[PDB]
Design an enzyme around this catalytic site. Structure first.
Site, mmCIF file in Angstrom:
data_model
loop_
_atom_site.group_PDB
_atom_site.id
_atom_site.type_symbol
_atom_site.label_atom_id
_atom_site.label_comp_id
_atom_site.label_asym_id
_atom_site.label_seq_id
_atom_site.Cartn_x
_atom_site.Cartn_y
_atom_site.Cartn_z
ATOM 1 N N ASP A 83 0.925 -1.605 0.003
ATOM 2 C CA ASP A 83 -0.153 -0.002 0.191
ATOM 3 C C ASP A 83 0.689 1.444 0.042
ATOM 4 O OD1 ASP A 83 -1.402 2.091 0.319
ATOM 5 O OD2 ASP A 83 -3.013 0.865 2.184
ATOM 6 N N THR A 84 1.668 2.309 -1.034
ATOM 7 C CA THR A 84 2.078 2.749 -1.545
ATOM 8 C C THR A 84 0.963 4.491 -1.053
ATOM 9 O OG1 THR A 84 1.193 4.004 -3.962
ATOM 10 C CG2 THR A 84 3.221 2.273 -3.127
ATOM 11 N N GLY A 85 -0.393 3.661 -0.686
ATOM 12 C CA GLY A 85 -1.133 5.497 -0.204
ATOM 13 C C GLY A 85 -0.996 5.403 1.541
HETATM 14 C C1 LIG Z 1 -6.786 0.970 3.764
HETATM 15 C C2 LIG Z 1 -6.746 0.272 2.286
HETATM 16 C C3 LIG Z 1 -7.169 -0.986 2.384
HETATM 17 C C4 LIG Z 1 -8.255 1.008 2.028
HETATM 18 N N1 LIG Z 1 -7.820 2.639 1.775
HETATM 19 C C5 LIG Z 1 -6.126 3.514 0.532
HETATM 20 C C6 LIG Z 1 -4.798 3.439 0.635
HETATM 21 O O1 LIG Z 1 -4.326 3.576 0.699
HETATM 22 C C7 LIG Z 1 -5.245 4.936 2.500
HETATM 23 C C8 LIG Z 1 -5.334 6.142 1.652
HETATM 24 C C9 LIG Z 1 -6.188 7.437 3.011
HETATM 25 C C10 LIG Z 1 -4.445 8.103 3.342
HETATM 26 C C11 LIG Z 1 -4.893 8.534 4.382
HETATM 27 C C12 LIG Z 1 -5.841 9.269 4.769
HETATM 28 C C13 LIG Z 1 -7.136 8.556 4.325
HETATM 29 C C14 LIG Z 1 -6.827 7.132 3.460
HETATM 30 N N2 LIG Z 1 -4.611 5.023 3.747
HETATM 31 C C15 LIG Z 1 -5.067 4.494 4.865
HETATM 32 O O2 LIG Z 1 -5.610 4.642 5.270
HETATM 33 O O3 LIG Z 1 -3.803 5.264 5.248
HETATM 34 C C16 LIG Z 1 -4.031 5.683 7.045
HETATM 35 C C17 LIG Z 1 -3.354 4.962 7.874
HETATM 36 C C18 LIG Z 1 -1.435 4.255 7.238
HETATM 37 O O4 LIG Z 1 -0.604 5.347 7.726
HETATM 38 C C19 LIG Z 1 -0.915 6.827 7.486
HETATM 39 O O5 LIG Z 1 -0.695 6.681 6.165
HETATM 40 C C20 LIG Z 1 -2.298 7.692 6.419
HETATM 41 C C21 LIG Z 1 -3.030 6.710 7.011
HETATM 42 C C22 LIG Z 1 -1.814 6.967 8.351
HETATM 43 C C23 LIG Z 1 -2.467 6.010 9.107
HETATM 44 S S1 LIG Z 1 -8.588 3.833 1.513
HETATM 45 O O6 LIG Z 1 -8.318 4.571 1.098
HETATM 46 O O7 LIG Z 1 -9.521 2.861 2.720
HETATM 47 C C24 LIG Z 1 -9.797 2.922 0.205
HETATM 48 C C25 LIG Z 1 -11.551 2.734 0.978
HETATM 49 C C26 LIG Z 1 -12.296 2.455 -0.313
HETATM 50 C C27 LIG Z 1 -11.820 2.472 -2.026
HETATM 51 B B1 LIG Z 1 -12.284 1.990 -2.344
HETATM 52 O O8 LIG Z 1 -13.393 0.914 -2.130
HETATM 53 O O9 LIG Z 1 -12.522 2.111 -4.156
HETATM 54 C C28 LIG Z 1 -10.444 3.236 -2.030
HETATM 55 C C29 LIG Z 1 -9.681 3.672 -0.987
#
Ligand SMILES: CC(C)CN(C[C@@H](O)[C@H](Cc1ccccc1)NC(=O)O[C@H]1[C@H]2CO[C@H]3OC[C@@H]1[C@H]3C2)S(=O)(=O)c1ccc(B(O)O)cc1
Ligand SMILES: [Cl-]
Ligand SMILES: [Cl-]
Ligand SMILES: [Cl-]
Ligand SMILES: [Cl-]
Ligand code: NA
Lengths: 99, 99
Positions: free
Chosen positions: A25-27
């Site tokens: 997960d690059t996000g």
């Molecule tokens: C969780 C995944 C299975 C899915 N996710 C994509 C994911 O990369 C998210 C993007 C994001 C980044 C920052 C804030 C909000 C969202 N990453 C995320 O929540 O990271 C968090 C945690 C990790 O360490 C820090 O880095 C950032 C913060 C913080 C705590 S998603 O965004 O929940 C998503 C769900 C569903 C659909 B769909 O159905 O197309 C599409 C997207």
């Protein structure tokens, strides 16, 4: 490997002698795993995602193998919907995005 | 380009005649953009991540330019804390994870 993105980038990890599935997960800044037992002390962290905040347990210097690559670093444990390998460990395995 | 993961992989996109910053996010199935207007039909959707679900509007057949590369696909619009370019559009610009 070169991983295309037509499907979710799921890999096998090994943590605490147990195999689990996780998403590359690059996000994600940080690696977040579902409830499990880890050794040592933990520190608190509140992390925010798409739907709001969750409380997690931060364990440092944890041995974890990711798609066969050995890493040692921070793992956040809590009520995540999926196991996510974030940039703190993707950098340890030498991952880049390319286009 | 090769994008390392020491920092968040942010790029500039053009969507709906607007420039925005967005994260290249291999952990997202679909692209999710903060509230904006787009043309054409939409339908409601609930999407879940860390912290639960948000309600979004699903717009199909939207053109985006991602770091200079044109693609077309579904864009979900709603109260995301970060603009996310998900796999549905990363595949179209030929993005891969490499290690
Ligand atoms: C969780 C995944 C299975 C899915 N996710 C994509 C994911 O990369 C998210 C993007 C994001 C980044 C920052 C804030 C909000 C969202 N990453 C995320 O929540 O990271 C968090 C945690 C990790 O360490 C820090 O880095 C950032 C913060 C913080 C705590 S998603 O965004 O929940 C998503 C769900 C569903 C659909 B769909 O159905 O197309 C599409 C997207
Ligand atoms: Cl770390
Ligand atoms: Cl950053
Ligand atoms: Cl699409
Ligand atoms: Cl391809
Ligand atoms: Na449309």
């Amino acid at each position: 490997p070169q991983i295309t993105l037509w499907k979710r980038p799921l890999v096998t990890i090994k943590i605490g002698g147990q195999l689990k599935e996780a998403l590359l997960d690059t996000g994600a800044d940080d690696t977040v795993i579902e409830e499990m037992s880890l050794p040592g002390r933990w520190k608190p962290k509140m992390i925010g995602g798409i739907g709001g905040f969750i409380k997690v347990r931060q364990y440092d210097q944890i041995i974890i193998e990711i798609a066969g690559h050995k890493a040692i670093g921070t793992v956040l444990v809590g009520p995540t919907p999926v196991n996510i390998i974030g940039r703190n460990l993707l950098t340890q395995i030498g991952a880049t995005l390319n286009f």
